[PDB]
Design a protein around this motif. Sequence first.
Motif, PDB file in Angstrom:
ATOM      1  N   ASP A   1      -2.346   6.434  -3.402  1.00 27.38           N
ATOM      2  CA  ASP A   1      -3.285   5.458  -3.794  1.00 27.38           C
ATOM      3  C   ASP A   1      -4.594   5.788  -3.292  1.00 27.38           C
ATOM      4  O   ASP A   1      -4.703   6.385  -2.164  1.00 27.38           O
ATOM      5  CB  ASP A   1      -2.719   4.128  -3.889  1.00 27.38           C
ATOM      6  CG  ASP A   1      -1.654   3.678  -4.357  1.00 27.38           C
ATOM      7  OD1 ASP A   1      -1.879   3.591  -5.862  1.00 27.38           O
ATOM      8  OD2 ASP A   1      -0.683   3.255  -4.108  1.00 27.38           O
ATOM      9  N   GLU A   2      -5.491   5.470  -4.210  1.00 29.18           N
ATOM     10  CA  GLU A   2      -6.985   5.647  -3.506  1.00 29.18           C
ATOM     11  C   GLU A   2      -7.525   4.228  -3.006  1.00 29.18           C
ATOM     12  O   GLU A   2      -7.111   3.087  -3.598  1.00 29.18           O
ATOM     13  CB  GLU A   2      -7.817   6.160  -4.567  1.00 29.18           C
ATOM     14  CG  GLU A   2      -7.541   7.405  -5.274  1.00 29.18           C
ATOM     15  CD  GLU A   2      -8.529   7.743  -6.443  1.00 29.18           C
ATOM     16  OE1 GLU A   2      -8.478   7.287  -7.459  1.00 29.18           O
ATOM     17  OE2 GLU A   2      -8.933   8.948  -6.305  1.00 29.18           O
ATOM     18  N   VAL A   3      -8.383   4.227  -1.964  1.00 19.86           N
ATOM     19  CA  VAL A   3      -9.007   3.126  -1.422  1.00 19.86           C
ATOM     20  C   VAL A   3     -10.308   3.334  -1.174  1.00 19.86           C
ATOM     21  O   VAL A   3     -10.926   4.226  -1.193  1.00 19.86           O
ATOM     22  CB  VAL A   3      -8.219   2.983   0.178  1.00 19.86           C
ATOM     23  CG1 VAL A   3      -8.780   1.875   0.792  1.00 19.86           C
ATOM     24  CG2 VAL A   3      -6.855   2.982   0.172  1.00 19.86           C
TER      25      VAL A   3
ATOM     26  N   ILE B   1      -7.725  -1.807  -2.696  1.00 16.63           N
ATOM     27  CA  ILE B   1      -6.938  -1.517  -3.645  1.00 16.63           C
ATOM     28  C   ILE B   1      -7.315  -2.219  -4.979  1.00 16.63           C
ATOM     29  O   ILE B   1      -8.202  -1.881  -5.701  1.00 16.63           O
ATOM     30  CB  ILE B   1      -5.532  -1.368  -2.978  1.00 16.63           C
ATOM     31  CG1 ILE B   1      -5.664  -0.715  -1.781  1.00 16.63           C
ATOM     32  CG2 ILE B   1      -4.879  -0.664  -4.290  1.00 16.63           C
ATOM     33  CD1 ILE B   1      -4.024  -0.610  -1.143  1.00 16.63           C
TER      34      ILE B   1
ATOM     35  N   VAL C   1      -9.463   1.879  -9.226  1.00 19.78           N
ATOM     36  CA  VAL C   1      -8.628   2.423  -8.047  1.00 19.78           C
ATOM     37  C   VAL C   1      -7.545   3.293  -8.719  1.00 19.78           C
ATOM     38  O   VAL C   1      -6.732   2.753  -9.724  1.00 19.78           O
ATOM     39  CB  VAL C   1      -8.221   1.428  -7.119  1.00 19.78           C
ATOM     40  CG1 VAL C   1      -7.453   1.873  -6.036  1.00 19.78           C
ATOM     41  CG2 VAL C   1      -9.147   0.352  -6.767  1.00 19.78           C
TER      42      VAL C   1
ATOM     43  N   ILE D   1       0.760  -1.223  -0.105  1.00 19.13           N
ATOM     44  CA  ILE D   1       0.160  -0.028   0.055  1.00 19.13           C
ATOM     45  C   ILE D   1       0.809   1.250  -0.017  1.00 19.13           C
ATOM     46  O   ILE D   1       1.869   1.327   0.688  1.00 19.13           O
ATOM     47  CB  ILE D   1      -0.798  -0.009   1.393  1.00 19.13           C
ATOM     48  CG1 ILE D   1      -0.194   0.193   2.645  1.00 19.13           C
ATOM     49  CG2 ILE D   1      -1.696  -1.193   1.141  1.00 19.13           C
ATOM     50  CD1 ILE D   1       0.655  -0.935   2.823  1.00 19.13           C
TER      51      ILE D   1
ATOM     52  N   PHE E   1      -3.609   4.595  -8.968  1.00 17.90           N
ATOM     53  CA  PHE E   1      -2.233   4.196  -8.627  1.00 17.90           C
ATOM     54  C   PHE E   1      -1.337   5.278  -9.037  1.00 17.90           C
ATOM     55  O   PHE E   1      -1.559   6.360  -9.691  1.00 17.90           O
ATOM     56  CB  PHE E   1      -2.054   2.970  -9.554  1.00 17.90           C
ATOM     57  CG  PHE E   1      -2.969   1.859  -9.196  1.00 17.90           C
ATOM     58  CD1 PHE E   1      -2.869   1.280  -7.809  1.00 17.90           C
ATOM     59  CD2 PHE E   1      -3.636   1.343 -10.066  1.00 17.90           C
ATOM     60  CE1 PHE E   1      -3.611   0.355  -7.393  1.00 17.90           C
ATOM     61  CE2 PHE E   1      -4.419   0.358  -9.433  1.00 17.90           C
ATOM     62  CZ  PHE E   1      -4.452  -0.284  -8.389  1.00 17.90           C
TER      63      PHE E   1
END
Lengths: 99, 60
Positions: A6-8, A69, A80, A2, A82
């Motif tokens: 990044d988006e979760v 993710i 998602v 992780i 990256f």
Amino acid sequence: KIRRDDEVIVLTGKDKGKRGKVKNVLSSGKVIVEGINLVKKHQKPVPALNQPGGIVEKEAAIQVSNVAIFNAATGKADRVGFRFEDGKKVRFFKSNSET
Amino acid sequence: MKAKELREKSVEELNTELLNLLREQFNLRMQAASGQLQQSHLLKQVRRDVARVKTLLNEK
RNA sequence: CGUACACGGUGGAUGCCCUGGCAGUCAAGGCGAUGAAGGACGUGCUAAUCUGCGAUAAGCGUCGGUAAGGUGAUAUGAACCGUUUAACCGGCGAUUUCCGAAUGGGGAACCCCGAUCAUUAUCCAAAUGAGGCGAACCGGGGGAACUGAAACAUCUAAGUACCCCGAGGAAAAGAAAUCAACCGAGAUUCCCCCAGUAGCGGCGAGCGAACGGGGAGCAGCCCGAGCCUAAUCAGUGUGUGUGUUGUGGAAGCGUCUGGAAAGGCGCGCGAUACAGGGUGACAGCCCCGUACACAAUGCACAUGCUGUAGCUCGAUGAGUAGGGCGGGCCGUGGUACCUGUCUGAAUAUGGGGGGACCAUCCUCCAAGGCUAAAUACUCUGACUGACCGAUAGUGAACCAGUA
RNA sequence: GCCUGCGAAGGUGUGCUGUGAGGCAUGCUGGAGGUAUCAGAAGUGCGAAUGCUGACAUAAGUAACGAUAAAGCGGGUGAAAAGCCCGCUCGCCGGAAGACCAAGGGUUCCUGUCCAACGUUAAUCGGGGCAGGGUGAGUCGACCCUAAGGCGAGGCCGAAA
């Protein structure tokens, strides 16, 4: 693994369905996502857990176990977010198996 | 200023610079007197500058 | 106030964990008067310690690698830097105040100069050397005692402890006036064996080889002349086999418990890669790493090559051999070796040796010299261990060689 | 060849079995792993060295605070004041508890804010804890030199610090 860039997507907590970027990652395993916050006393948009006390850490304390993710399996999650300057990482990102 | 800039400068330019930076190395010293516009960035930077140019001067 | 138990405390055992030790293994291996090792004292906005540096002070520059995160351990507050691509990693370069083995002289870090010995010497220190440090190993000298002999003066512990001087990364030895089963072996060390035999010993206790054989490693040569050129010397060019980091690197799966699995249960997988660690609780298939791959440096031991440069003839070292006196030491016996005093040959148509002396065989020839290769330790780097686990283990897993 | 977070090892209490040395079960707790068979293993199984180290009980809430033997009466401040401060009264010391200094110690000096720790009681006090400030000389002292004496260099002795 992780990253902060990044988006979760939540899937269990009461914040299930909320989207956002990773604020920061602690050596504790917890991750705070831009969105999962709490309403303090003087109503200040600041992430934190729900419990009485004096001075306590911020962040809603999310877990990588209930996040979403790039899970290589059939789920309800979707797209998602990256790096790119790496080049080699672009190949993995292009593959529907890794990133 | 970076090493690249000092190397390009002439022997006299490095002297006028060392001197300019020397004259420059005066203005500051006013905090203890109760100043404000005094910056901490160049405090440590200027000493390096007058030194960097001082190193190249010998390299020549 | 006796005794048991209950709740709470004191206390700290125990169970588990452990960024530590202990031990083995591989690799690697010197520093300095171009003044090092060590120490003192500075240096980060605040920092008292430790570490890194050192007044361009936990930093500066170049190249390469790398990468967006970074500004040492402390995740603090303030705050800075980075894409004019930093941090970080590797190599190298620049700089590097004063004191400091410094040696001008004195001195518990402070003030003024090549001090001392020695060589060459234009005798002007002008040109040079020595004077220090370093884990053990190595070489050359000096040299005990307690103890054992259940006393003790030989003997034994000792040729050890310790002391003096010195080299290298390796030293010492060494080409045989040897050995001596033999029409033979045949440079010297080291390992194994031969021997715990021969030998020594109030022959009491104890002490204790060698030749040879089986292996490791193999190289032989130089001091008067004649002659001429590929030994040697001087110089030049200059390696194959590498050092650290980054790149080519698969992989949360399901159910249940839980705040979380590196759980239970079910299933699958890696392997010229079946160490270990990290990640919220026992994940070889989460991350690093292990086999692997690539690029930066050091070493580049060697070889090649230039000019030197073969080869030939004769001889071969006397206060020595040997003898006597007084000692040391050795397994050394009248038959080991060495020191000191005295005496003192011959000479290869000669002499020495084969563990007794003197005449007769065999072998070999001293009294001059040099010589590669075969094991050691362990500071350092890495790995491993049916080792120990924080009244254990190194004294030190917490400021420790500190309080 | 099995057990385990529908929970183990360990610990406490208890039941059962073995001649025993022990095994085993239950409840609580723990809450991470732990065994049986056969086999090999260990620095293996322990109350009794004026033993070693740490901890602890009874003893004891027992023993002790003494020539500079001086405090007392009011008042002030304070949440508290018998020993902080004010006034008065009553005394001690005088080669001395006075004044100035060496050595040594070393900032312990002064001011402000406090006191958890120190002060053989308490403390709003301190030579205590924290944060600042203070030791501005040519004629003071250091710095300089020298005495007993010592050191280094040349000279001379197996060798040499």
